[PDB]
Amino acid sequence: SYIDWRTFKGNGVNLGGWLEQESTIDSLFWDKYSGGASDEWGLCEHLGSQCGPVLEHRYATLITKADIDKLASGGITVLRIPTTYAAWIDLPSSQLYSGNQTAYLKEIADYAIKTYNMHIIIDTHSLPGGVNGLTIGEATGHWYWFYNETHFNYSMQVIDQVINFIQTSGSPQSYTLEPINEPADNNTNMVVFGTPLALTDHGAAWVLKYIRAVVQRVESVNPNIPVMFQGSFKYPQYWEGDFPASTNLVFDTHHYYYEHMDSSSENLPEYILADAREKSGTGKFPVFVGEWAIQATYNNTLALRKRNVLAGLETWSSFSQGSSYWTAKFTGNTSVAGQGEQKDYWCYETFIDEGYFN
Amino acid sequence: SYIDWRTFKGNGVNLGGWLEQESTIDSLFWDKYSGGASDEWGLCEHLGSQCGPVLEHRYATLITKADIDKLASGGITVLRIPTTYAAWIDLPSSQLYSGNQTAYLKEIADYAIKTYNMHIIIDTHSLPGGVNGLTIGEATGHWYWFYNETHFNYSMQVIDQVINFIQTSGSPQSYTLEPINEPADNNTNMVVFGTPLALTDHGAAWVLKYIRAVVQRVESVNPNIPVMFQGSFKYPQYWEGDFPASTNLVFDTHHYYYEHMDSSSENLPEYILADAREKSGTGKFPVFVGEWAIQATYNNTLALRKRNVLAGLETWSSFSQGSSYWTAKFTGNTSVAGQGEQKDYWCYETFIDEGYFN
Numbered sequence A, B: 001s002y003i004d005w006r007t008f009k010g011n012g013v014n015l016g017g018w019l020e021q022e023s024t025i026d027s028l029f030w031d032k033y034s035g036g037a038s039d040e041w042g043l044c045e046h047l048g049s050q051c052g053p054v055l056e057h058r059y060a061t062l063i064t065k066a067d068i069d070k071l072a073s074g075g076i077t078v079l080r081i082p083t084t085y086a087a088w089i090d091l092p093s094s095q096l097y098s099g100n101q102t103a104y105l106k107e108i109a110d111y112a113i114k115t116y117n118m119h120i121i122i123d124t125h126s127l128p129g130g131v132n133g134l135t136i137g138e139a140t141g142h143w144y145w146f147y148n149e150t151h152f153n154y155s156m157q158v159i160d161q162v163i164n165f166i167q168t169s170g171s172p173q174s175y176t177l178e179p180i181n182e183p184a185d186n187n188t189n190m191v192v193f194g195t196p197l198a199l200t201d202h203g204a205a206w207v208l209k210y211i212r213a214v215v216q217r218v219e220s221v222n223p224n225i226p227v228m229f230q231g232s233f234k235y236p237q238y239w240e241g242d243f244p245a246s247t248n249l250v251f252d253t254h255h256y257y258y259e260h261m262d263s264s265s266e267n268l269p270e271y272i273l274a275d276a277r278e279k280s281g282t283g284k285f286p287v288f289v290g291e292w293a294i295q296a297t298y299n300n301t302l303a304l305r306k307r308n309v310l311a312g313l314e315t316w317s318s319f320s321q322g323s324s325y326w327t328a329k330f331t332g333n334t335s336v337a338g339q340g341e342q343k344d345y346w347c348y349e350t351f352i353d354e355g356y357f358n
């Protein structure tokens, strides 16, 4: 049976840093291979024709069936899988690597579906030209996707391949299609990132043109495949009037606490409640918290991690359809304000191993 | 006969633009007398020897006993009265005018107390050296108050004058003392104004030093006079741990909607309820919403003004101790996004005359 996001609930994890690369997730990897680049675009440029061999090794080794077993043992029922657009289309001007990403995606998705009946969200984390001027959108400094009909068409070509991957998977009912991640056209000053000010009405109109095109394409092939819309950092309420209630649509909200607020480990449940109570729409469409983590801006403490993770899970499940944590596997050693490093707050496998869900 | 802000409830108004001047409140005044200045400081500098005569005329005519009768007829029971520090002390390095402000304040306050038993909040809206780089803090570009013992000392001199006014008033039980308004040390980029990022922890420590000194000074003379702490745009929770619950303290929160969010006239009650639910503290101390107004960032409509004012009044008096609208009398004709001008959304006497409170 296909899922109805209005009645489905699940707690999940992101498989971040696996098919798309970021400096913070694995410090050893980045130090060894980036040449100091800020982005996956530059890491691949730095490696030159060794970019593919290095990345294929990481694809084959970072996330294996054993990771899926560990996640299932901790009660995970949803995997969100960020991918670069270059897994789906090979554009000669892109510096992102086009390889066997989807073969590893299929191996891990098949195992999670056939073994555990997990639900899989396929996220095209970047789109051609760049959606937010960050590494995750294509490359640092790239916002060329907006208002560009060539990049629009390439984005639809990418989505035609993701729909086909789902439709021919053997279990189309196991997947949700997420065609954009954190679009932003007003974040030259990063103080507005994570806020409604990251996306202007002009940018939002282009995003809406794209999501409407994706919805029409999915409906033309298989209307039972849900579309997960990551509406930047606008409240879901902002987009509600743009879609009829009959659309097979779920919103993906992202909630973080690690900068730009007076959060602490002590008060983190108050900030999580605020986000759940104020940023979950009116109920017109369902909401899933597709990314979050417990790192606070100030005064991180190690002893409140279990309390904070469990408070977040219960909050997202109470005000929305559940959540997926960023991220499954994280070894980055960037210092946090207070106790420890990012790997102590951002690695979901560590929480499982330390018995937070027993 | 003194009030306990934990039990007291009241709906009030600000008498803004009366004893402190701002460009938006009265366009004819500003266009005639400012010479293009951004601030009261520069308006007074431009007028030179005519500054006093021009301001004394406004003091005597803008707010009269007739205004108090109209406000009372609309159910007003609290007056918040913004003053410049120059009402209280005459510093030789200040371009703000020192005249008969407190004589006009006493005529109106005494009338309001004797006739209607209104409660009076005396607000020192500016302090020597400037508390937020804005005209309201002293002058555009002035942040000199922070970490400066000269300005600290003359601030305490201002507070001694306000305490003496209250104690010699003939009704000390009728007054709350508010010794600062919207301090901000991190608003050189005004995108952070209205948010917690407008005040750094370093600036917040200086504000705390000052409020602790004011609380001690009032406790030393008449501990039954409440102190109203306007803690910038931090959540009240930020400051709660800094005072014992026995402190005769109330927080003043300021909630506005006219920039930096996806607010509309249609959705304004959602934004009002979000502020009340998340920005009212934990209950350790009482909260009063000392400034608010109904102008939204987008799609202002005149038709929803009554619904929006009543929604806000009801929300602030349920989740806190009430509110005071900005402002009693407003003729500024700056355009808003949507229909109308600022005078349609910022003039409380207009709401009374349209029968909103009948």
Ligand SMILES: *[C@@H]1O[C@H](CO)[C@@H](O)[C@H](O)[C@H]1NC(C)=O
Residues within 6 Å of the ligand: A027, A028, A029, A031, A333
């Ligand atoms: C962080 O990881 C990098 C790369 O492995 C390593 O060079 C560095 O010494 C680490 N720092 C600490 C303090 O562990």
Ligand SMILES: *[C@@H]1O[C@H](CO)[C@@H](O)[C@H](O)[C@H]1NC(C)=O
Residues within 6 Å of the ligand: A052, A056, A099, A100, A103
């Ligand atoms: C892609 O996978 C195929 C089949 O397993 C393999 O033959 C080939 O070497 C892989 N290509 C790269 C670029 O690693």
Ligand SMILES: *[C@@H]1O[C@H](CO)[C@@H](O)[C@H](O)[C@H]1NC(C)=O
Residues within 6 Å of the ligand: A144, A147, A148, A149, A150, A151
């Ligand atoms: C859109 O992107 C294409 C591919 O880079 C580029 O050649 C073109 O100049 C851009 N068009 C506009 C409208 O800027």
Ligand SMILES: *[C@@H]1O[C@H](CO)[C@@H](O)[C@H](O)[C@H]1NC(C)=O
Residues within 6 Å of the ligand: A149, A150, A153
């Ligand atoms: C985009 O794709 C459509 C449909 O195939 C085509 O009609 C259109 O001309 C293309 N536009 C560009 C800029 O390539």
Ligand SMILES: *[C@@H]1O[C@H](CO)[C@@H](O)[C@H](O)[C@H]1NC(C)=O
Residues within 6 Å of the ligand: A186, A188, A189, A192, A196, A197, A198, A199, A200, A201, B191, B260
């Ligand atoms: C864009 O961001 C700037 C801050 O860099 C902000 O001042 C401005 O209001 C934002 N514009 C929109 C439409 O969000």
Ligand SMILES: *[C@@H]1O[C@H](CO)[C@@H](O)[C@H](O)[C@H]1NC(C)=O
Residues within 6 Å of the ligand: B027, B028, B029, B031, B333, B334
């Ligand atoms: C605003 O009022 C000023 C001062 O009376 C007047 O000169 C100006 O034309 C008005 N602007 C309008 C009505 O928008």
Ligand SMILES: *[C@@H]1O[C@H](CO)[C@@H](O)[C@H](O)[C@H]1NC(C)=O
Residues within 6 Å of the ligand: B052, B056, B099, B100, B103
């Ligand atoms: C202040 O009020 C007093 C008493 O009515 C009056 O004598 C004086 O002229 C006024 N001062 C100024 C500077 O207008």
Ligand SMILES: *[C@@H]1O[C@H](CO)[C@@H](O)[C@H](O)[C@H]1NC(C)=O
Residues within 6 Å of the ligand: B129, B144, B148, B149, B150, B151
């Ligand atoms: C405080 O600041 C003013 C400038 O606003 C300066 O004249 C004064 O010397 C400073 N006082 C101290 C004690 O630094």
Ligand SMILES: *[C@@H]1O[C@H](CO)[C@@H](O)[C@H](O)[C@H]1NC(C)=O
Residues within 6 Å of the ligand: B149, B150, B153
């Ligand atoms: C502030 O007043 C205190 C107490 O009278 C005095 O000791 C000090 O020197 C004054 N500081 C300045 C900078 O005027």
Ligand SMILES: *[C@@H]1O[C@H](CO)[C@@H](O)[C@H](O)[C@H]1NC(C)=O
Residues within 6 Å of the ligand: A191, A260, B186, B188, B189, B192, B196, B197, B198, B199, B200, B201
């Ligand atoms: C100060 O404001 C800037 C934006 O202009 C923001 O980037 C920064 O985080 C703020 N700092 C603090 C300590 O609030």
